[PDB]
Amino acid sequence: SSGSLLNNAIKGGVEDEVTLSAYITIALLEIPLTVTHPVVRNALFCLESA
Amino acid sequence: CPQLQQYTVRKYFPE
């Protein structure tokens, strides 16, 4: 979380790195993106573990 | 990380 925001009302989450990474990777996956992709692979590792 | 807190001759061709 490179936190440089102004307000947290705009964001509907708790700023956990887990949730942040989760919202990230889901925003990625809504793009048609292969699950074998590196970044998503790492993200999935995080998701599994978390 | 930065501060989080904020507000005889015949010529041939020559050349």
Curated annotation (Swiss-Prot), chain A:
It is found in: Secreted. Secreted in plasma. Is able to inhibit all four classes of proteinases by a unique 'trapping' mechanism. This protein has a peptide stretch, called the 'bait region' which contains specific cleavage sites for different proteinases. When a proteinase cleaves the bait region, a conformational change is induced in the protein which traps the proteinase. The entrapped enzyme remains active against low molecular weight substrates (activity against high molecular weight substrates is greatly reduced). Homotetramer; disulfide-linked. Belongs to the protease inhibitor I39 (alpha-2-macroglobulin) family. This is Alpha-2-macroglobulin. It comes from Homo sapiens (Human).
